Amino acid sequence: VYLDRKLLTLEDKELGSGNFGTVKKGYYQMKKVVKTVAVKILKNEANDPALKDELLAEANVMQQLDNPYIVRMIGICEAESWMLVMEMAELGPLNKYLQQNRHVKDKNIIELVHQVSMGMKYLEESNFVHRDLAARNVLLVTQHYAKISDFGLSKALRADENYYKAQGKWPVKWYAPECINYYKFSSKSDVWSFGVLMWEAFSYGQKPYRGMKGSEVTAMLEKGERMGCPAGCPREMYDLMNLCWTYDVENRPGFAAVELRLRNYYYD
C-alpha cells in the first residue's frame, strides 16, 4: 500500500541529494504522534522510469528489513513525485560527523563500527547484499547509535547462490576485487567494503585512497598492497581491516566472524 500524502508535511530543509533528486526533512502523522522523517523525492516529478523502478526496488528491500541498526522505511507515497519516507537519523552521515568531531574517542568509534557490523550480520543472515557500504551510508541517530542507510543498490540473493551477478554507480574504492573483475557481489564483498568503512571511521571521515584513480587502486590491490593504519587507530582494529581486505573470497571472514571480533574487542 501507499502512504497518504495528506499526512506528510515536507520542510524546506535539504538533507542530501544525488542523481535521483533530493532528500528533505519532514513530518508524518502516525496513528497518534507525529514522527520526524527523511524523505527521498525523485526529481522531475518522477518522469524517469529508471529512477521510479530503482526507488520501488529500494522500498521493496527496506520493507523486508527490521533491525535496530538499519534505517526504517515508513512507506512510499505517490504524489507530486514518488517519495520514500524513512525514520530520520538526525545527526546525519558518519563520515561528515567525524570530520567535524575529532574529539570522538576510539572506544566510541569502535562502538559505532560494531553497531554497523551487527546490522550487516543481520543483512547477511537475511541474504541481502548491500553493495554500497561506506561511511557516507551510515547515519547517526546519536553519537552512540549508528544505522546503515542507502539501500538503492541492494539485492535479495537467489535461494541457490550466495552472490549477485551484476549485468550504474561504480564506487571502485569500496569494491572487492571479485566485484571489479567478475561482477560478483556477496556478503563477503560487503565485508571488504566494511573494511574500507572501518578505515574511514578511524580516519575521522577521510576519503580512502586519496588522490588515486580507480585503475591505480585496482592495480595497488592486485599487487597485495593496502592502505596504511590510520593515526591513533588501535592495532587490533587495523588487523581486522586487513582481514576484511583478504583477496580470496573464501578465506575472507563473513559478518558473523567480523561482528564477534568487534564485540570481543569492545568488551575487552
Residues of each annotated binding site for ATP: 15-23, 40
DSSP bridge partners of 115: none
76 near 228, Cβ under 8 Å? no
Given the residues 132, 150, 248, 268, the one annotated as active site = 132
Contact string (CB under 6 A) for ligand 6ZG, positions 229-248, x = contact: --------------------
Q: Which stretch binds ligand 6ZG (CB under 6 A): 41-49, 132-140, 202-210, 231-239?
A: 132-140
132 as an active site residue: the answer is yes
150 part of the interface to ligand 6ZG, by CB under 6 A? yes
Measured CA to CA, the distance from residue 176 to residue 155 in angstroms comes to 17
What is the C-alpha separation between 76 and 85, in angstroms, rounded? Answer: 6
Which residues neighbour 169 within 8 Å (Cβ) at sequence distance 6 or greater? 132, 153
Cα 207 off chain centre by: 15
Does 21 bind ligand 6ZG (CB under 6 A)? Our answer is: no
**Cα end-to-end distance, the chain, whole Å:** 47
Which residues, listed in sequence order, are joined to residue 78 by a DSSP beta bridge? 82
Pick one of 80, 90, 125, 239: the residue that binds ligand 6ZG (CB under 6 A): 90
What one-character DSSP code corresponds to residue 230? P
- For residues 93 and 149, what is the distance between their CA atoms, to the nearest angstrom? 9
Which CB atom, from 88 or from 240, has the smaller least distance to ligand 6ZG? 88
- 3-state DSSP call for residue 173? helix
Q: Does 62 sit near ligand 6ZG (CB under 6 A)?
A: no
Taking CB under 6 A as the binding criterion, the range among 91-99, 110-118, 209-217, 235-243 that sits at the site for ligand 6ZG is: 91-99
**Is 149 near ligand 6ZG (CB under 6 A)?**
yes
Helix (H), strand (E) at residue 236:
helix 235-244
Question: Of the two residues 147 and 155, which places its CB atom closer to ligand 6ZG in the complex?
Answer: 147
**Minimum CB distance to ligand 6ZG smaller for 65 or for 240:** 65
Q: Binding-site residues, please? A: 15-23, 40
* Site residues (vs ligand 6ZG, CB under 6 A): 15-16, 23, 38, 71, 86, 88-93, 136-137, 139, 149-150
Active site residues: 132
